[PDB]
Design a protein around this motif. Structure first.
Motif, PDB file in Angstrom:
ATOM      1  N   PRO A 148       0.932  -1.133   0.125  1.00  0.00           N
ATOM      2  CA  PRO A 148       0.092  -0.242   0.097  1.00  0.00           C
ATOM      3  C   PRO A 148       0.809   1.192   0.116  1.00  0.00           C
ATOM      4  O   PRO A 148       2.063   1.359  -0.120  1.00  0.00           O
ATOM      5  CB  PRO A 148      -0.721  -0.130   1.303  1.00  0.00           C
ATOM      6  CG  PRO A 148       0.273  -0.797   2.278  1.00  0.00           C
ATOM      7  CD  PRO A 148       0.928  -1.683   1.281  1.00  0.00           C
ATOM      8  N   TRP A 149       0.248   2.548   0.041  1.00  0.00           N
ATOM      9  CA  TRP A 149       0.857   3.609   0.095  1.00  0.00           C
ATOM     10  C   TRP A 149       1.099   4.254   1.490  1.00  0.00           C
ATOM     11  O   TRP A 149       1.805   5.399   1.236  1.00  0.00           O
ATOM     12  CB  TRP A 149      -0.183   4.471  -1.024  1.00  0.00           C
ATOM     13  CG  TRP A 149      -1.325   4.781  -0.294  1.00  0.00           C
ATOM     14  CD1 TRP A 149      -2.810   3.828  -0.981  1.00  0.00           C
ATOM     15  CD2 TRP A 149      -1.871   5.440   0.567  1.00  0.00           C
ATOM     16  NE1 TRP A 149      -3.762   4.195  -0.381  1.00  0.00           N
ATOM     17  CE2 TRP A 149      -3.422   5.266   0.576  1.00  0.00           C
ATOM     18  CE3 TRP A 149      -1.333   6.556   1.743  1.00  0.00           C
ATOM     19  CZ2 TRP A 149      -4.324   5.886   1.663  1.00  0.00           C
ATOM     20  CZ3 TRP A 149      -2.274   7.026   2.615  1.00  0.00           C
ATOM     21  CH2 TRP A 149      -3.708   6.659   2.409  1.00  0.00           C
ATOM     22  N   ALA A 175       2.132   0.443  -4.427  1.00  0.00           N
ATOM     23  CA  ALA A 175       1.053   1.125  -4.800  1.00  0.00           C
ATOM     24  C   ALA A 175       1.306   2.194  -5.840  1.00  0.00           C
ATOM     25  O   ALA A 175       2.360   2.785  -5.960  1.00  0.00           O
ATOM     26  CB  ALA A 175       0.617   1.789  -3.319  1.00  0.00           C
ATOM     27  N   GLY A 204       3.139  -0.680 -12.055  1.00  0.00           N
ATOM     28  CA  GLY A 204       1.675  -0.587 -12.991  1.00  0.00           C
ATOM     29  C   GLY A 204       0.333  -0.901 -11.911  1.00  0.00           C
ATOM     30  O   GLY A 204       0.442  -1.220 -10.750  1.00  0.00           O
ATOM     31  N   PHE A 224       0.296  -9.595   0.575  1.00  0.00           N
ATOM     32  CA  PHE A 224      -0.503  -8.344   0.246  1.00  0.00           C
ATOM     33  C   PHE A 224      -0.771  -7.685   1.375  1.00  0.00           C
ATOM     34  O   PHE A 224      -1.359  -7.951   2.642  1.00  0.00           O
ATOM     35  CB  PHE A 224      -1.736  -8.867  -0.301  1.00  0.00           C
ATOM     36  CG  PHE A 224      -2.625  -7.865  -0.689  1.00  0.00           C
ATOM     37  CD1 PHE A 224      -2.622  -6.970  -1.705  1.00  0.00           C
ATOM     38  CD2 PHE A 224      -3.917  -7.687   0.362  1.00  0.00           C
ATOM     39  CE1 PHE A 224      -3.651  -5.914  -1.987  1.00  0.00           C
ATOM     40  CE2 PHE A 224      -4.605  -6.649  -0.047  1.00  0.00           C
ATOM     41  CZ  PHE A 224      -4.403  -5.737  -0.988  1.00  0.00           C
ATOM     42  N   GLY A 226      -3.290  -4.201   2.040  1.00  0.00           N
ATOM     43  CA  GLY A 226      -4.320  -3.160   1.757  1.00  0.00           C
ATOM     44  C   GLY A 226      -5.733  -3.401   1.910  1.00  0.00           C
ATOM     45  O   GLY A 226      -5.909  -3.794   3.126  1.00  0.00           O
ATOM     46  N   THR A 230      -9.933  -5.849  -1.456  1.00  0.00           N
ATOM     47  CA  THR A 230      -9.002  -6.257  -2.382  1.00  0.00           C
ATOM     48  C   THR A 230      -8.345  -7.561  -2.048  1.00  0.00           C
ATOM     49  O   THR A 230      -8.171  -8.446  -2.874  1.00  0.00           O
ATOM     50  CB  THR A 230      -8.036  -5.295  -2.488  1.00  0.00           C
ATOM     51  OG1 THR A 230      -8.296  -3.927  -2.818  1.00  0.00           O
ATOM     52  CG2 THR A 230      -7.167  -5.528  -3.569  1.00  0.00           C
ATOM     53  N   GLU A 248      -2.741  -8.413   5.066  1.00  0.00           N
ATOM     54  CA  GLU A 248      -2.885  -7.589   6.302  1.00  0.00           C
ATOM     55  C   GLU A 248      -3.793  -6.726   5.871  1.00  0.00           C
ATOM     56  O   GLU A 248      -3.410  -5.579   4.874  1.00  0.00           O
ATOM     57  CB  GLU A 248      -1.836  -7.320   6.620  1.00  0.00           C
ATOM     58  CG  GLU A 248      -0.473  -8.151   6.672  1.00  0.00           C
ATOM     59  CD  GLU A 248       0.573  -8.531   7.796  1.00  0.00           C
ATOM     60  OE1 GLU A 248       1.498  -7.621   7.685  1.00  0.00           O
ATOM     61  OE2 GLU A 248       0.366  -9.161   8.616  1.00  0.00           O
ATOM     62  N   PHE A 379      -9.622   5.451   7.256  1.00  0.00           N
ATOM     63  CA  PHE A 379      -8.215   5.437   7.000  1.00  0.00           C
ATOM     64  C   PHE A 379      -7.824   7.100   6.981  1.00  0.00           C
ATOM     65  O   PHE A 379      -7.424   7.574   5.852  1.00  0.00           O
ATOM     66  CB  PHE A 379      -7.816   4.701   6.071  1.00  0.00           C
ATOM     67  CG  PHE A 379      -6.492   4.157   5.946  1.00  0.00           C
ATOM     68  CD1 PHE A 379      -6.007   3.384   6.806  1.00  0.00           C
ATOM     69  CD2 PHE A 379      -5.616   4.797   4.939  1.00  0.00           C
ATOM     70  CE1 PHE A 379      -4.718   2.750   6.766  1.00  0.00           C
ATOM     71  CE2 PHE A 379      -4.100   4.020   5.013  1.00  0.00           C
ATOM     72  CZ  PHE A 379      -3.724   3.209   5.711  1.00  0.00           C
ATOM     73  N   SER A 450      -9.569  -8.273   9.420  1.00  0.00           N
ATOM     74  CA  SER A 450      -8.050  -7.608   9.188  1.00  0.00           C
ATOM     75  C   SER A 450      -7.223  -8.558   8.555  1.00  0.00           C
ATOM     76  O   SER A 450      -5.890  -8.220   8.236  1.00  0.00           O
ATOM     77  CB  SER A 450      -7.723  -7.254  10.674  1.00  0.00           C
ATOM     78  OG  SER A 450      -8.516  -6.171  11.060  1.00  0.00           O
TER      79      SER A 450
HETATM   80  N1  LIG Z   1      -3.223  -4.784   7.880  1.00  0.00           N
HETATM   81  C1  LIG Z   1      -2.250  -3.963   7.800  1.00  0.00           C
HETATM   82  O1  LIG Z   1      -0.983  -4.406   8.267  1.00  0.00           O
HETATM   83  C2  LIG Z   1      -2.248  -2.804   7.093  1.00  0.00           C
HETATM   84  C3  LIG Z   1      -1.043  -1.678   7.102  1.00  0.00           C
HETATM   85  C4  LIG Z   1      -0.934  -0.805   6.242  1.00  0.00           C
HETATM   86  C5  LIG Z   1      -1.843  -0.689   4.973  1.00  0.00           C
HETATM   87  N2  LIG Z   1      -3.294  -1.273   5.139  1.00  0.00           N
HETATM   88  C6  LIG Z   1      -4.417  -1.310   4.412  1.00  0.00           C
HETATM   89  O2  LIG Z   1      -4.111  -0.644   3.267  1.00  0.00           O
HETATM   90  C7  LIG Z   1      -5.373   0.205   2.862  1.00  0.00           C
HETATM   91  C8  LIG Z   1      -4.901   1.366   2.042  1.00  0.00           C
HETATM   92  O3  LIG Z   1      -3.943   0.868   1.170  1.00  0.00           O
HETATM   93  P1  LIG Z   1      -4.474   0.853  -0.506  1.00  0.00           P
HETATM   94  O4  LIG Z   1      -5.379   1.991  -0.784  1.00  0.00           O
HETATM   95  O5  LIG Z   1      -3.268   0.894  -1.312  1.00  0.00           O
HETATM   96  O6  LIG Z   1      -4.935  -0.532  -0.766  1.00  0.00           O
HETATM   97  P2  LIG Z   1      -5.526  -1.442  -1.893  1.00  0.00           P
HETATM   98  O7  LIG Z   1      -6.622  -0.642  -2.625  1.00  0.00           O
HETATM   99  O8  LIG Z   1      -6.273  -2.527  -1.430  1.00  0.00           O
HETATM  100  O9  LIG Z   1      -4.329  -1.769  -2.954  1.00  0.00           O
HETATM  101  C9  LIG Z   1      -3.181  -2.305  -2.433  1.00  0.00           C
HETATM  102  C10 LIG Z   1      -2.307  -2.912  -3.397  1.00  0.00           C
HETATM  103  O10 LIG Z   1      -3.107  -3.740  -4.314  1.00  0.00           O
HETATM  104  C11 LIG Z   1      -3.140  -3.229  -5.325  1.00  0.00           C
HETATM  105  N3  LIG Z   1      -4.264  -3.789  -5.896  1.00  0.00           N
HETATM  106  C12 LIG Z   1      -5.429  -3.128  -6.369  1.00  0.00           C
HETATM  107  N4  LIG Z   1      -6.293  -4.305  -6.903  1.00  0.00           N
HETATM  108  C13 LIG Z   1      -5.591  -5.029  -7.124  1.00  0.00           C
HETATM  109  C14 LIG Z   1      -5.931  -6.327  -7.750  1.00  0.00           C
HETATM  110  N5  LIG Z   1      -7.287  -6.650  -8.442  1.00  0.00           N
HETATM  111  N6  LIG Z   1      -4.942  -7.334  -7.977  1.00  0.00           N
HETATM  112  C15 LIG Z   1      -3.797  -7.225  -7.226  1.00  0.00           C
HETATM  113  N7  LIG Z   1      -3.245  -6.103  -6.713  1.00  0.00           N
HETATM  114  C16 LIG Z   1      -4.352  -5.088  -6.485  1.00  0.00           C
HETATM  115  C17 LIG Z   1      -2.784  -2.031  -5.375  1.00  0.00           C
HETATM  116  O11 LIG Z   1      -2.299  -1.472  -6.505  1.00  0.00           O
HETATM  117  P3  LIG Z   1      -2.946  -0.213  -7.185  1.00  0.00           P
HETATM  118  O12 LIG Z   1      -2.154   1.101  -6.205  1.00  0.00           O
HETATM  119  O13 LIG Z   1      -2.306   0.059  -8.557  1.00  0.00           O
HETATM  120  O14 LIG Z   1      -4.519   0.022  -7.203  1.00  0.00           O
HETATM  121  C18 LIG Z   1      -2.104  -1.588  -4.427  1.00  0.00           C
HETATM  122  O15 LIG Z   1      -0.847  -2.221  -4.663  1.00  0.00           O
HETATM  123  C19 LIG Z   1      -5.721   0.884   4.038  1.00  0.00           C
HETATM  124  O16 LIG Z   1      -6.914   1.225   3.893  1.00  0.00           O
HETATM  125  C20 LIG Z   1      -5.687  -0.241   5.049  1.00  0.00           C
HETATM  126  O17 LIG Z   1      -6.818  -1.016   4.749  1.00  0.00           O
HETATM  127  C21 LIG Z   1      -3.348  -2.318   6.143  1.00  0.00           C
END
Ligand SMILES: NC(=O)c1ccc[n+]([C@@H]2O[C@H](COP(=O)([O-])OP(=O)(O)OC[C@H]3O[C@@H](n4cnc5c(N)ncnc54)[C@H](OP(=O)(O)O)[C@@H]3O)[C@@H](O)[C@H]2O)c1
Ligand SMILES: NC(=O)c1ccc[n+]([C@@H]2O[C@H](COP(=O)([O-])OP(=O)(O)OC[C@H]3O[C@@H](n4cnc5c(N)ncnc54)[C@H](OP(=O)(O)O)[C@@H]3O)[C@@H](O)[C@H]2O)c1
Lengths: 486, 485
Positions: A148-149, A175, A204, A224, A226, A230, A248, A379, A450
């Motif tokens: 993630p970002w 991300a 990408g 993973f 995110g 997702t 996570e 978030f 989670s």
């Molecule tokens: N549990 C933990 O330890 C933890 C700690 C840190 C972050 N986070 C979570 O991360 C969330 C925010 O990060 P985020 O906006 O980057 O989450 P995200 O939208 O789920 O995306 C995360 C990663 O997955 C990629 N992705 C999106 N769709 C995909 C698909 N169909 N197949 C494979 N990869 C895909 C994204 O790429 P793209 O950017 O190109 O879309 C990105 O690299 C937070 O809201 C939180 O929920 C959780």
């Protein structure tokens, strides 16, 4: 002086199509860099490179992989200020946030190097005569890393460094909002001279590059971090080739404050836990739950310290408290949370203004369980405070969430602390500290929505290796068929 | 005979009253009327397990161990009934079902022995004044979904270990072995386990199993069955983020080098390849022999195969092979034989079938394109392949989508260890059968053979999670707001 590019099989290069996108700063919208917009074929090339590199990487002694990681550690130390720069301008993190992330990342790489030689299997007692029975550890193979970002460096490097230490090869897709951090990681790996194909970076879109990683037959595992939605989609698609996953998926962590606390300290701790990095932390204290006997004093003190928070361009100086949110979609979402809370009768104690990608802390009281900020992961810097009458109620509200990452309780009473810790449904819990406590070698992960698995130190090794039972039988046996013998 | 579900401490009919008749693979005779449960019966079991969870997980482990030691006591008194049902319902010979029952006693005892001893960790904190530990916690309600080949031992390995560590259970046995499952529930009932801790629901996989796999209150599913089913289960399980353990069959290689006692190797290979009519996930399904002993090996192997006695397993204690579980299995074996003949295979012996009985069909002159080299052959059809050296033995051994177990027969320490290292499987055995198995070792595969490990503490790892807890003993300063003071 350098273009941002993919890193595949030891070579920095453009995506096959040559398509690119412009990465801008969330601070002021200025241009940072053009970056690749890779597609399926770039992903496949990275996977094939990781696959061809696998056997040589897995079969060298662990001490040799540790050596490469110590090299990476050396290069990372040289690159610290470049990483801090990029985390600030591309990710919007303040000086103190990105400093902390870089310090932690150094510790993570070192931790992975330290542990590589020490991951042990078991020697077993056999129930049979004349047999030796042991269990080896083996690497899973090529591992997709999708990140993630919010803490793009430390989260990526926890996954990457540990996965590599134990003999897996890597295909990494950062991300889309933080590609330069990903490219700087590739720079670091390249300067440390890891063998070609062992580590690959593909920049990408998730639904294209990420999906190819998740569905490719040569990928053995995907780790993973995110959104929960997702993650469930990834876990579903991963089943097609029976690859394992680590997930996570965010949290809505409860911070529970009892009546016997130092109220002022509780408030200082709560402000840090709930609003650091603008609340953009998976283990942020997203739901604050206070005992009624101290609620008035706590709320007063909490708001008092929130008033002091300084929100600014994080490049301006080292004392800025909060920077911007990552993009305009996040601002729009935080507005929805505030709007929903106010319309439901919620009391906005302080905050609420936004400008560009900046969004002020917005603190609520008088909420109930149907508020979007009680039901969803928030978030960002919008936070509910819930007043409760006793510990049973504290636990009930704490558990009334689909998530279960971390949690914390503040109290000086050993009985109340331990009972609450036991009863709160979370993967991690902290007595008298912030919800986002994290160390490099502890099992970090959640339950419920989670996610699945644990990362950090040997727990990461558990996720990306398998146990291999091997026996040697030292006697000849007689067999039950054919019964006609002898 | 009439059989029921066991839900929340009560044996009861399915709520539709729907039932079906189960017949013996041996002669087609009636054995029992069994529930044909639906989604509502599964939901009830899941709900019962969920409501029993808190009290079951939170008692000291020693209390759970006592219940398991009681189950062990009851099982010991029911042995003969299990053997009877395993033979009449499952088609197993006396030797087979005796072995399964002996192993089952060991599994139950192993789960009881280990319950009090599953440890977490105390860690070194990188921070001052911080206590940092890791607890083990039950996942919750666990679905267990099982196959028909070793229905007792496979079910109990999952059931006993999962219970030991404080999970509750919803169990759905294979449709071809529902009486075995009912007998298990009888054993649990007599052990006096608290209501809802263990529940049996007999019904179709696509209905009862699907509900278990997709239900929000189930935390984990442990599954043994076909690879294709496992993939569907894993995909479904994702919707609620439940974890899974999957053992999905194998196509295990048995590698025989030129320095062996050839007669011994033949005897070992016959047992390993054809016990329980080859209906074992870790059956030696692809036999790979060094050219220097191939002719001699093949002759001796066929010689021993010739001696196998196939008969009604109820007849006496010395029957070597019984029937296959059903007519669908015989038809599948015929497909395998048909394909091997069409590709130039040489049928050295066997192939005769009648009803559910099948005489072991042994092929030579096979290549990598034969279905019996490319697929799991869960039945008594076996290829023997000849290789020129150890590199080829390994190449053939690894030329499969599966990766469960495997074995090498040789007296040379270097060749044995080099081959063991190179073969891609989750388990490997030097100088013994492919299907070696103990109660407390990690049993499981890689590649298409599935995910995770079961047996002793490895079963505990699958159905618990780690929970990091800290206590911080000092107050500290925080970086925001920076204006402090
Ligand atoms: N549990 C933990 O330890 C933890 C700690 C840190 C972050 N986070 C979570 O991360 C969330 C925010 O990060 P985020 O906006 O980057 O989450 P995200 O939208 O789920 O995306 C995360 C990663 O997955 C990629 N992705 C999106 N769709 C995909 C698909 N169909 N197949 C494979 N990869 C895909 C994204 O790429 P793209 O950017 O190109 O879309 C990105 O690299 C937070 O809201 C939180 O929920 C959780
Ligand atoms: N790796 C191992 O440890 C190992 C050892 C023993 C057996 N086996 C494997 O098991 C295979 C044979 O057993 P099998 O014929 O019973 O395999 P199976 O068809 O996959 O069925 C296994 C179990 O899953 C149930 N099932 C079917 N569809 C389901 C669904 N959509 N959702 C949930 N459950 C579902 C079955 O119920 P129904 O009976 O109603 O269909 C049965 O209880 C062998 O070929 C071998 O691959 C593997």
């Amino acid at each position: 002086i350098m273009k941002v590019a993919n890193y595949i099989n030891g070579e920095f290069k453009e995506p096959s199509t040559g398509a690119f996108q412009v990465k801008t700063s969330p601070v002021d919208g200025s241009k940072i860099a053009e970056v690749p917009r890779s597609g399926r074929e770039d992903a496949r090339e990275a996977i094939d490179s990781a696959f061809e590199a696998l056997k040589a990487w897995a079969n060298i002694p662990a001490i040799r992989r540790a050596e490469y990681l110590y090299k990476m550690l050396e290069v990372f130390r040289q690159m610290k200020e470049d990483f801090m720069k990029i985390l600030t301008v591309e990710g919007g993190g303040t000086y103190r946030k990105v400093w902390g992330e870089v310090v932690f990342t150094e510790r993570l790489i070192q931790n992975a190097a330290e542990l590589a030689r020490h991951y042990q299997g078991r020697v077993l007692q056999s129930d049979s005569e004349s047999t030796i029975s042991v269990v080896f550890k083996r690497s899973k193979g090529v591992v997709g890393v999708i990140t993630p970002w919010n803490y793009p460096l430390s989260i990526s490097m926890k996954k990457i460094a540990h996965t590599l230490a134990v003999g897996n090869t890597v295909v990494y897709k950062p991300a889309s909002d933080t590609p330069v951090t990903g490219w700087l990681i590739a720079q670091m790996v390249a300067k440390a001279g890891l063998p070609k194909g062992v580590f690959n970076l593909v920049i990408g879109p998730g639904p294209v590059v990420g999906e190819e990683i998740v569905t490719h037959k040569r990928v053995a595992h995907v780790t993973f971090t995110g959104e929960s939605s997702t993650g469930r989609e990834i876990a579903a698609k991963a089943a097609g080739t029976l690859k394992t996953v680590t997930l996570e998926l965010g949290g809505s962590d409860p911070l529970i404050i009892l009546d016997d606390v130092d109220v002022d300290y509780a408030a200082r701790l709560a402000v840090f836990a709930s609003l650091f990095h603008q609340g953009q932390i998976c283990t942020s204290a997203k739901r604050i739950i206070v005992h009624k006997a101290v609620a008035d004093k706590f709320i007063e003190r909490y708001v008092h310290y929130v008033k002091m928070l300084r929100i600014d361009d994080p490049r301006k100086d080292e004392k800025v408290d909060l920077g911007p949110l990552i993009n305009e979609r996040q601002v729009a979402l935080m507005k929805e949370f505030v709007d929903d809370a106010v319309s439901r009768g919620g009391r906005l104690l302080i905050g609420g203004r936004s400008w560009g990608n900046f969004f002020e802390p917005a603190i609520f009281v008088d909420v109930d369980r149907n508020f979007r900020i009680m039901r969803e992961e928030v978030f960002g810097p919008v936070r509910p405070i819930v007043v409760v009458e006793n510990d049973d109620q504290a636990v009930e509200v704490a558990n009334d969430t689909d998530y279960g990452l971390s949690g914390a309780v503040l109290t000086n009473n050993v009985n109340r602390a331990f009972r609450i810790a036991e009863a709160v449904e979370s993967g991690m819990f902290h007595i008298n500290d912030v919800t986002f406590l994290e160390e490099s070698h502890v099992p970090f992960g959640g339950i419920k929505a989670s996610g699945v698995g644990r990362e950090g130190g040997e727990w990461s090794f558990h996720e990306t290796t398998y146990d291999r039972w091997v026996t040697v039988t030292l006697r000849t046996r007689r067999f039950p068929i054919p019964s006609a013998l002898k």
